[PDB]
Amino acid sequence: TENFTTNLNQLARVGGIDPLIGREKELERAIQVLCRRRKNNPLLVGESGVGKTAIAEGLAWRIVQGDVPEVMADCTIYSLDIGSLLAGTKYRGDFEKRFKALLKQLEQDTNSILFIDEIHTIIGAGAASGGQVDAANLIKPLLSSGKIRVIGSTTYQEFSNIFEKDRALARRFQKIDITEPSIEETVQIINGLKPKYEAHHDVRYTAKAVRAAVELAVKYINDRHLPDKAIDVIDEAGARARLMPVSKRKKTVNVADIESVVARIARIPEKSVSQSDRDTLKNLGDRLKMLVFGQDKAIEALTEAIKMARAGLGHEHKPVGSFLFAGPTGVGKTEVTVQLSKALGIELLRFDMSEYMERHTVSRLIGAPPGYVGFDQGGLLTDAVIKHPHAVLLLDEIEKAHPDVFNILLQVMDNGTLTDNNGRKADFRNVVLVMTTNAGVRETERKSIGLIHQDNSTDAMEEIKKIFTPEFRNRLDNIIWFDHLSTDVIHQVVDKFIVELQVQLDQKGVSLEVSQEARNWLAEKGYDRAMGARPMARVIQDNLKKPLANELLFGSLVDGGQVTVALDKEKNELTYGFQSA
Amino acid sequence: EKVRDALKPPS
Numbered sequence: 164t165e166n167f168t169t170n171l172n173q174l175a176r177v178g179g180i181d182p183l184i185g186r187e188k189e190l191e192r193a194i195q196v197l198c199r200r201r202k203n204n205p206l207l208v209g210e211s212g213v214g215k216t217a218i219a220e221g222l223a224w225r226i227v228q229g230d231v232p233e234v235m236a237d238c239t240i241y242s243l244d245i246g247s248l249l250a251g252t253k254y255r256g257d258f259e260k261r262f263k264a265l266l267k268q269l270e271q272d273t274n275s276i277l278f279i280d281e282i283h284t285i286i287g288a289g290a291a292s293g294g295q296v297d298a299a300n301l302i303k304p305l306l307s308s309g310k311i312r313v314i315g316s317t318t319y320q321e322f323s324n325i326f327e328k329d330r331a332l333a334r335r336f337q338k339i340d341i342t343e344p345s346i347e348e349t350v351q352i353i354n355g356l357k358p359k360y361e362a363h364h365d366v367r368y369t370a371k372a373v374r375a376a377v378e379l380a381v382k383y384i385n386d387r388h389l390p391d392k393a394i395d396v397i398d399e400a401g402a403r404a405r406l407m408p409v410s411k412r413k414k415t416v417n418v419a420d421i422e423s424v425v426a427r428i429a430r431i432p433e434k435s436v437s438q439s440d441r442d443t444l445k446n447l448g449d450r451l452k453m454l455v456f457g458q459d460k461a462i463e464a465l466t467e468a469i470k471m472a473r474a475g476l477g478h479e480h481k482p483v484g485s486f487l488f489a490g491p492t493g494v495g496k497t498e499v500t501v502q503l504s505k506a507l508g509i510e511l512l513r514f515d516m517s518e519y520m521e522r523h524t525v526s527r528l529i530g531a532p533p534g535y536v537g538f539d540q541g542g543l544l545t546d547a548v549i550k551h552p553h554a555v556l557l558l559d560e561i562e563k564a565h566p567d568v569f570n571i572l573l574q575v576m577d578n579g580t581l582t583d584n585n586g587r588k589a590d591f592r593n594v595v596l597v598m599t600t601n602a603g604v605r606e607t608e609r610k611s612i613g614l615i616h617q618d619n620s621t622d623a624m625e626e627i628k629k630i631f632t633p634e635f636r637n638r639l640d641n642i643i644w645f646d647h648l649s650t651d652v653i654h655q656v657v658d659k660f661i662v663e664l665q666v667q668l669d670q671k672g673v674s675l676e677v678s679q680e681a682r683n684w685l686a687e688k689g690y691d692r693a694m695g696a697r698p699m700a701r702v703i704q705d706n707l708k709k710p711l712a713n714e715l716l717f718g719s720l721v722d723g724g725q726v727t728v729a730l731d732k733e734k735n736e737l738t739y740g741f742q743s744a
Numbered sequence: 745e746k747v748r749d750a751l752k753p754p755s
């Protein structure tokens with residue numbers, strides 16, 4: 164049976180098993196259970212990555228070192244590979260004969276312990292062809308007698324769904340809970356393991372690098388547990404050195420490299436922003452101001468919030484920024500958000516909230532429809548952010564959506580984490596949240612019944628209070644009220660559409676030239692404060708795009724030629740020169 | 745549906 168089992172004592176004495184630092188309380192309890200007259204079978208139940216197998220294997224390391232009670236000295240721990248027990252047990256009784264042979268060896272010596280990792284796998288392993296004589300049944304009687312000692316290791320999920328179902332087997336095993344360690348005791352673990360990782364990668368770690376790897380991983384890496392969540396960084400940090408040139412910092416790894424690794428694992432922007440990002444960040448306001456005019460206050464809020472986060476002054480657990488964009492039509496509420504994603508080169512998560520008006524549709528954001536038997540038990544909002552943690556989240560026309568959606572965002576803005584029905588948590592700490600609403604648009608469009616016209620901007624705010632609950636509005640960073648487009652910015656808006664037209668025309672091979680007088684004429688005809696910038700596109704479409712379209716298709720522009728537009732003051736009508744070729 | 749099968753040789 165030497166093939167099926169492995170002697171941890173022998174393996175630990177020569178190569179090493181990644182020694183167990185601390186965990187004195189757990190080992191004392193385990194040894195207490197192992198010294199029991201009967202049912203002396205400890206079970207190390209804990210979350211993944213909490214050192215369940217380091218305690219059982221570490222116990223062997225302590226025995227050879229001698230740091231154990233005299234009762235434990237001279238004991239040999241054997242690890243069971245169930246894959247080898249069931250290797251060639253095709254014929255009836257091969258497994259039972261093979262398995263029982265192993266038990267006789269343990270009972271005969273009476274000073275040997277058996278370690279079964281993933282112990283939940285002995286509940287249905289090679290029992291029979293539609294029979295109930297399983298390995299668990301074969302070990303059960305021996306366990307109660309106390310002739311042999313068996314150490315188990317299994318996750319909470321497996322222990323309850325599988326191991327707990329067999330009440331008889333669970334009775335024999337004494338559940339020893341294992342808890343995730345704290346920050347302080349965790350750094351001691353890495354320090355003790357560090358010599359094994361340093362030699363493997365031929366690197367050295369600083370005192371501050373280890374402290375940072377632990378603290379940073381806890382902050383950003385939320386889908387793992389601390390003992391291993393902090394060793395992935397350490398292990399991955401050393402590997403980076405090997406890939407780099409022999410002359411490029413191979414000897415040691417500093418705190419700067421550690422934060423780089425965490426950023427890649429969590430797909431979040433790394434600290435110590437490069438000068439490249441700074442140039443884009445400083446110019447972020449100016450770049451946005453070249454595509455959206457008259458809304459400098461909104462752009463400042465978005466850019467400043469991003470700067471605070473990168474600088475390190477961002478919210479501890481809240482998102483980068485939560486905003487509500489309320490304003491008249493065509494004022495750039497959605498355009499600024501769409502262009503923000505392009506300026507930052509990050510994914511845009513645009514959710515149209517007019518499709519979530521129904522209450523049942525809100526469960527899709529954080530779950531699946533009731534009674535869905537398939538595999539896609541995920542939420543569109545939770546999975547989107549999980550796939551793109553660093554992104555811009557746009558909830559267009561959120562006021563249309565059911566009030567339940569607001570309640571779903573309370574934890575998104577106050578705590579930064581939204582949990583799916585399955586129980587996985589998403590991170591919104593780097594996702595810029597921008598909401599857009601047209602509340603009070605009718606109030607602004609209508610005119611007050613009075614000698615003096617009234618600014619209905621305040622009426623929209625009162626509507627915002629009625630629609631949104633106070634808790635939801637308090638969490639928001641700020642409620643930006645977009646303002647109507649003035650005649651001055653409209654001239655800039657017309658220039659924006661004209662360049663967009665030129666880009667479309669460039670593919671066709673035709674170049675458009677518009678005189679300044681013509682551009683002003685377009686603005687006056689299409690200017691509508693109430694309707695914003697959208698009428699400007701329509702006037703340009705009716706006046707400029709229409710003549711060009713007929714010519715491009717029906718003649719004088721099939722082949723690329725220059726175009727010139729001018730205004731006739733006498734006729735107060737535009738003119739065009741097609742000038743083919 | 746997937747069930748293991750244990751065989752036996754004739755002799």
Ligand SMILES: Nc1ncnc2c1ncn2[C@@H]1O[C@H](COP(=O)(O)OP(=O)(O)OP(O)(O)=S)[C@@H](O)[C@H]1O
Pocket residue numbers: 181182183184209210211212213214215216217280281316317318352356390391394
């Ligand atoms: N002293 C230590 N304390 C805790 N974890 C350690 C220690 N030394 C190493 N480790 C790491 O912890 C891992 C063991 O994590 P455990 O929680 O015991 O889970 P496991 O044995 O891998 O089984 P699963 O995956 O949880 S079913 C090792 O493989 C190392 O990566």
Ligand SMILES: Nc1ncnc2c1ncn2[C@@H]1O[C@H](COP(=O)(O)OP(=O)(O)OP(O)(O)=S)[C@@H](O)[C@H]1O
Pocket residue numbers: 454455456457458491492493494495496497498499560599600601648656659695696697700
């Ligand atoms: N301030 C602005 N500067 C430049 N273009 C703008 C501006 N506001 C609107 N536009 C243009 O107008 C069109 C619609 O812009 P949007 O940002 O969708 O308007 P909006 O007011 O947010 O829309 P709703 O329907 O009221 S939510 C696009 O062609 C935009 O480029």
Ligand SMILES: [Mg+2]
Pocket residue numbers: 496497559599
């Ligand atoms: Mg819009």
